[PDB]
């Protein structure tokens, strides 16, 4: 159903690098230029205190909606990715259910400022203390550490494009019906990413990329903390959490 479900030549791999970088550029949610410009715009002590005084449920609802907005851009990225729309609907949903949160966790390093350990949230930069009302301090600290580690790699926009395409197209996800088609698309996207790193003298980042188990651990922690919150405020999740968020993380 697609050229990239079979062996691709060097010229086809070059074409794939460009296509992936284009798909990412058109769906990145926030502009890198905007994120860097806004670094000097930091929440005041008064503003941090205001977020800390919010109820646990109010903060969970806000963060669930921010995650859902980010995920909607990843769904559009997937739709634009060569070969993804040629996979069967079962497989597209398996790949998105397993990988959309992983892609958001990678993308968010762009919005993280390693100089002062702050993230861009609701118009300004704030530290992990902004999220204290959620009552999931280990998960927040793990997300900040993850962004800090990716920030140390000094990714270009094109490297994030290619690395996130590969995070999404993972033939090991349980539930894939057309596993061999996904394996070949993954192989070609791996070649595109590695070709780009070779061409730009950036192959040294490969040994520095986080292990898959790290992204899995973050996703598992998020689902675990959500289950704890849901037990405390079931009607908040039922009535006020976004439907897409529930489809991805609380089985509908």
């Amino acid at each position: 159903e697609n050229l990239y479900f079979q062996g691709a030549s060097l010229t086809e791999i070059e074409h794939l690098v460009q296509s992936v970088c284009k798909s990412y550029r058109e769906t990145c949610q926030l502009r890198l230029e905007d994120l860097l410009r806004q670094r000097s715009n930091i929440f005041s002590r008064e503003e941090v205190t205001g977020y800390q005084r919010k109820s646990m449920w109010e903060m969970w609802e806000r963060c669930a909606h921010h995650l859902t907005e980010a995920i909607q851009y990843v769904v559009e990225f997937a739709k634009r990715l060569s070969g993804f729309m040629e996979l069967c609907q079962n497989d597209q949903i398996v790949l998105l259910k397993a990988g959309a949160m992983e892609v958001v966790l990678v993308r968010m390093c762009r919005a993280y400022n390693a100089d002062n350990r702050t993230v861009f949230f609701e118009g300004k930069y704030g530290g992990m203390e902004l999220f204290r009302a959620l009552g999931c301090s280990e998960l927040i600290s793990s997300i900040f550490d993850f962004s800090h580690s990716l920030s140390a790699l000094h990714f270009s926009e094109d490297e994030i494009a290619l690395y996130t395409a590969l995070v999404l197209i993972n033939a090991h996800r349980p539930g894939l019906q057309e596993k061999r088609k996904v394996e070949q698309l993954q192989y070609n996207l791996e070649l595109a990413f590695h070709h780009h790193l070779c061409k730009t003298h950036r192959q040294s980042i490969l040994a520095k990329l986080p292990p898959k188990g790290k992204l899995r651990s973050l996703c598992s922690q998020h689902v675990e903390r959500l289950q704890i919150f849901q037990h405390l405020h079931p009607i908040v999740v039922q009535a006020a959490f976004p439907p897409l968020y529930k489809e991805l993380f609380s089985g509908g």
Binding site: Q72, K79, Q89, I93, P243, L244, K246, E247, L248, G252
Partner: peptide, 12 residues
């Protein structure tokens, strides 16, 4: 029983 992904995937 929320199903949104199928709508997003099928919307052009």
């Amino acid at each position: 029983k929320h199903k949104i992904l199928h709508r997003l995937l099928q919307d052009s």
